[PDB]
């Protein structure tokens, strides 16, 4: 049958123009005052999935 997309991956990742995968950063949810502003600003940015994990993320999204 048809391949099924993982429901959690399709709410956490996105594709870019050249094929890289967009992602958010962790450690940004609730324990915030003790962290530095530089740390929090770096964590607020979007990032890309690492090369060693692209295969697993693509399998989760059905090679998308």
């Amino acid at each position: 049958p048809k391949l099924k997309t993982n429901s959690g991956a399709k709410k956490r990742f996105a594709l870019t123009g050249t094929g890289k995968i967009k992602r958010k950063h962790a450690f940004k949810s609730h324990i915030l005052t003790k962290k530095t502003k530089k740390q929090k600003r770096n964590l607020t940015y979007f990032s890309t999935v690492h090369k060693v994990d692209e295969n697993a993320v693509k399998q989760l999204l059905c090679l998308r």
Partner: protein, 146 residues
């Protein structure tokens, strides 16, 4: 000529066949290694599994929302308008754009500014970028949003 058919070189290839002796280099363990989960019949990969450590599709948060009234425009750039007109035209329109296979029938068109539109044209599109509209009007054209 059915007695002398031949396919192109390198077009057909024999399939791999495992577990049929030592000379093939694929017998015995038949490419599976020695023991463990991966050697058994019926093993399949658990796609998100990482051995028990919290997987990447769980360590990371969800983000965003999808708008149920989103509007998307098919981008038709400036250099296409001058190319199509000269090839085939001095008044471009959606029904003409569809007739030349450049856009589907039920699709909305916005004109952008990637190129030059030197030829003087009257243009009927659903949407126009600020720079794209100025490019036509400067080149002695007309812009009709409809």
């Amino acid at each position: 000529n059915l007695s002398s058919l031949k396919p192109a070189e390198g077009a057909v290839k024999s399939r791999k066949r495992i577990g049929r002796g030592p000379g093939s280099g694929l017998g015995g363990t038949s490419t599976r290694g020695h023991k463990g989960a991966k050697s058994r019949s019926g093993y399949s990969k658990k796609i998100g599994f990482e051995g028990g450590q919290m997987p990447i599709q769980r360590r990371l948060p969800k983000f965003g929302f999808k708008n149920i009234n989103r509007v998307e425009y098919k981008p038709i750039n400036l250099s296409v308008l001058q190319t199509l007109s000269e090839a085939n035209l001095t008044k471009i329109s959606v029904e003409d754009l569809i007739a030349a296979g450049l856009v589907s029938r039920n699709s909305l068109v916005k004109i952008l500014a990637n190129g030059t539109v030197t030829t003087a044209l009257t243009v009927e599109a659903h949407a126009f970028s600020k720079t794209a509209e100025e490019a036509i009007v400067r080149a002695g054209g007309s812009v009709v949003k409809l």
